[PDB]
Amino acid sequence: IVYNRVKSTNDLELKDRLVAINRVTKVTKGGRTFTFAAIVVVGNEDGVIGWGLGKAGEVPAAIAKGVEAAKKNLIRVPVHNGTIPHEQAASYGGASVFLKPATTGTGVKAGGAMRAVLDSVGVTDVLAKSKGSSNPHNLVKATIQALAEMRSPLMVAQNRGISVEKV
Amino acid sequence: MTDPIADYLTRLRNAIMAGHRVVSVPASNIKKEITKILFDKGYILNYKFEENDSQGIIKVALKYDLAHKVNAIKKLKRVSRPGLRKYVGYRDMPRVLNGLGIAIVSTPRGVMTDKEARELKVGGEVLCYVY
Amino acid sequence: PNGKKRKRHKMATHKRKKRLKKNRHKK
Amino acid sequence: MYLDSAKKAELFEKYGKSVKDTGSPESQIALFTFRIAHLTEHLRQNKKDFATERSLKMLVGKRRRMLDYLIKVDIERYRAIIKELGIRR
RNA sequence: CACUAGGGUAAACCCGGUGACUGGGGCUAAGUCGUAACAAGGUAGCCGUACCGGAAGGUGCGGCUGGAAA
RNA sequence: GGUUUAAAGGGUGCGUAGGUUGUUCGGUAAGUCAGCGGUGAACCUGAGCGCUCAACGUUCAGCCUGCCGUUGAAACUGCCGGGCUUGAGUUCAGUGGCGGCAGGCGGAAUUCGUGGUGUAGCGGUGAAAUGCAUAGAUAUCACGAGGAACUCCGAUGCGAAGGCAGCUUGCCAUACUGCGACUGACACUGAAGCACGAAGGCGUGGGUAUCAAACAGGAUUAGAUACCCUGGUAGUCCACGCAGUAAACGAUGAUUACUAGGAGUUUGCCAAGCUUCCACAGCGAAAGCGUUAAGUAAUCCACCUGGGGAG
RNA sequence: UCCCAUUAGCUUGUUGGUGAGGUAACGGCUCACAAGGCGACGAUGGGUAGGGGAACUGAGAGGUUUAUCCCCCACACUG
Ligand SMILES: [K+]
Ligand SMILES: [K+]
Ligand SMILES: [Mg+2]
Ligand SMILES: [Mg+2]
Ligand SMILES: [Mg+2]
Ligand SMILES: [Mg+2]
Ligand SMILES: [Mg+2]
Ligand SMILES: [Mg+2]
Ligand SMILES: [Mg+2]
Ligand code: NA
């Protein structure tokens, strides 16, 4: 279902953004074991966007592993100009997101994980709402799947078999 | 049976989700009009009306994109249910998927889509959303 | 299915029934 | 309910056109009333047959719904049938 | 001479207060007596009902698994 | 927005008001749609103008997107009249059952009494004691009496639910399948209300064998108002009448239609109608559900809104 | 055009008629046959409040209040 993309050696414009840092714990007989998990979103300011989770014992190592995983896992999103073709709602775990296209001079009306995802994908005119949990993993995944479920008018006409649906 | 139109939409939706190619529905005049609208707008591959001793059968052949293995129809939603009827004027006609979908609406000029309803300046009962 | 939830209700029922049995036969 | 095919045929011949009309509202109402009376007679002896009760009540409900259909369709037929059966009480 | 505001009378109702004495509850510490539940918590646990005990509780009858072991 | 497990499905039905209503033809115009007309200071929105700017003041264009009146339209809902058979019901046939109520009959086991044989213990526990026994127990044989429960079959099946199991009969009820029969939408749900509703408990009268709350005794313990042992009264049984509760549970309301595979299983002919376990899509926070959904949809009812106080 | 059903029945000029009187005016408004009227589409009773445009607030739906401003109503120590 996802468009997917090979390692973008040519499309090396992938800027990496950090969503959240967490210090998870594991218990053993000796004591407690501490690690670090980072959520990293790589984007080329175009429909290409990837997400990754990097786990390590140190923050730079976790961020690097997240960058690597995000680079490995890439998809393409059908974005026209700085907006989205239509509205779209998505759910992933306890997180629910809703995106609506806005006017050209509106900016991005979102904050946090959704704002990071939208910046990485290169959408600059959208109203975004979160109606579920604020979990970073689920918010990032729900926003990405909302973007992936979109369809431009050309694709709509293509799978409908017609040319102009009075658009 | 409580809502034959919702049942028709549900049959189509379940056939699409299961991946079937042909779905058979009991026939009705409004259902025949809806099937004609769907064929005209290009959501279904073909249809056929069979007049047996019963009320009849509508046989619908669905349209699949061989390029992507994706049906032409994504969402079918019933709007005006028996428990809550919805009527709109031509000025407040809904727009589905920002104009990329259709809204089948019954008007005094007949059963049509929101686009021609707006063009002819007639309102009525919003049957369903398709995209 | 913790158990403490039902333990609290069991305690409350015990107290209420003890109150009633003590109040019986007195007018 | 001492009910058999001969009694059912006699009832259908008495109420409703022809003896083969087992499905007429009048025929059904007559059959329901007959077995209602017989079940009442059975219950007065077997006062603890709570299963024969509520079967009696379901029969009463069926008869009431048929009478309501007769109201909605043809009132004169309802007057005639309740007069001929002595139902209202 | 009727009509009536207002006055007196009685009742009964409603709304409030106070009262010898006599009961629960919440919160804080921790004095005293035990160990009921959480592991098969050392008698599997719990639900309903009845009787009985300084208290957690115990026992009878039916039910449930939101129980091991088998 | 929710209700298997976080708060949240009524114990289960029948049913009043109400809500919803298969298909088709013809009317009507209540809902619905459209046109025209009337009506609806200041403030608030684009453009100006004046306050030296600005608040502000003021003018004009853009809102009137409610209400009322009057003309048309007839797709849908409503109302009226007619038609159809698929839903629903009636009939006929086949098959099936721990389904209900009532009357009869039976054997194993247990308890008590009487008689015969026989004498040093029996019973019980982790170990004991209480207890019963030379004024004759336990054990064994026969006679007599009474109450309660139905081994094997036996894990499935039936019922609205609670529940239903020795055999037999009578009287009822009902499910499923088909009909070349009949009626012709007569349907679904259902606040009130009514009926039924395990065990325990209450009243009156019978009965009272086993077991056994309370109670009494003997043990174990620092104590033991318990767990163990020996007794033992209500109760457990029947008839009638109250009461109306449960972890009354699938912790999952009732209808309707649709949507994959495997493995078993009951019934009348491959196939329904069931009854059980893995498991696609999908759903879910997860455990998990998955054609008997917790999936996809429509109708109606019940219920939830942090914990305690507090049912 | 607000809450309470831990408020379910209320009503005897009360519902209608004939006539008369009275009023600026119709009318049980008042005065001399029939038994009707209102009620789970919430009567009756109890509690609370002047009502709108404004104003504020929110994407909207909506929510809060009517301090100053405008309109309507009620009142002038208590009857
Ligand atoms: K049960
Ligand atoms: K219809
Ligand atoms: Mg207790
Ligand atoms: Mg303990
Ligand atoms: Mg214990
Ligand atoms: Mg005791
Ligand atoms: Mg719960
Ligand atoms: Mg239930
Ligand atoms: Mg419950
Ligand atoms: Na008794």
- Closest-CA distance of chain B to residue A1, Å: 9
∠ at Cα A15 (A9, A18), nearest 5°? 130
Token pair for residue B104? 């089948």
Whether chain B has a CB inside 8 Å of the CB on A151: the answer is yes
Å: D36 CA to F26 C1': 43
CA distances from A123 to A117, A127, A147, B68 (A): 9, 11, 10, 26
CB contact under 8 A, B70 and A159: yes
B38 and B16 Cβ atoms separated by less than 8 Å: no
DSSP D86: T
DSSP character string of D25-70:
HHHHHHHHHHHHHHHHHHHHHSTT-TTTTTHHHHHHHHHHHHHHHH
DSSP character string of A34-103:
E-EEEEEEEE-SSSEEEEEEEEESSHHHHHHHHHHHHHHSEEE---BTTB-SS-EEEEETTEEEEEEE--
Listed residue (A82, A85, A104) closest to A147, CA to CA: A85
B44 and B61 Cβ atoms separated by less than 8 Å: yes
∠ at Cα B113 (B65, B108), nearest 5°? 155
CA distance A8 to A74: 9
Which residues in chain A have Cβ-Cβ distances shorter than 8 Å to B99? 165-167
D27 and D36 Cβ atoms separated by less than 8 Å: no
Would you tell me the crossing angle of helices D75-85 and D55-73 to the nearest 10 degrees? 140
Sign of the four-CA dihedral A78, A84, A88, A93: positive
Q: Which residues pair with A103 in a beta bridge?
A: none
CA distance A49 to A42: 6
B27 and B52 Cβ atoms separated by less than 8 Å: no
CA distance A136 to A17: 13
CA distance A16 to A119: 10
Return the exposure string of D17-53: e unless at least 16 CB atoms fall within 10 Å of the residue's CB, then b. Answer: eeeeeeebbbbbbbbbbbbbeebeeebeeeeeeeeee
Residue B129's region, left for phi above 0, alpha for psi from -120 to 50, else beta, is beta
B62 and B93 Cβ atoms separated by less than 8 Å: no
CB contact under 8 A, B99 and A166: yes
B81 and B3 Cβ atoms separated by less than 8 Å: yes
A147 and A74 Cβ atoms separated by less than 8 Å: no
DSSP D6: H
∠ at Cα D3 (D2, D5), nearest 5°? 145
Neighbours of ion ligand 3 (CB under 5 A): C 14
Q: Resolution of this entry in Å?
A: 2.7
- Closest-CA distance of chain A to residue B54, Å: 33
Which residues in chain A have Cβ-Cβ distances shorter than 8 Å to B67? 158
Over the Cα atoms of chain A, what is R_g?
18
CB contact under 8 A, B100 and A85: yes
Å: B89 CA to G72 C1': 36
Nucleotide nearest to C4 (CA to C1'): E37
Q: Return the C-alpha torsion angle B102, B106, B112, B113, nearest 10.
A: -20
A20 and A39 Cβ atoms separated by less than 8 Å: yes
Token pair for residue D64? 């009431």
Of A86, A159, A166, the CB nearest to B97: A86
D63 and D33 Cβ atoms separated by less than 8 Å: yes
Residue A118 CA, distance from chain mean position: 7
∠ at Cα B68 (B62, B74), nearest 5°? 50
Under DSSP, is residue A147 helix (H, G, I), strand (E, B) or coil? helix
Longest Cα separation, chain D: 40
B60 and B47 Cβ atoms separated by less than 8 Å: yes
Return the exposure string of B86-96: e unless at least 16 CB atoms fall within 10 Å of the residue's CB, then b. Answer: eebebeebeeb
Token pair for residue A93? 């775990």
Element holding A117 (H helix, E strand): helix A113-121
Token pair for residue D78? 């309802």
CA distance D80 to D89: 16
Selected for mutation to probe chain B from A86, A125, A159 (highest B CB count within 10 Å) is A159
Listed residue (A141, A146, A128, A41) closest to A94, CA to CA: A141
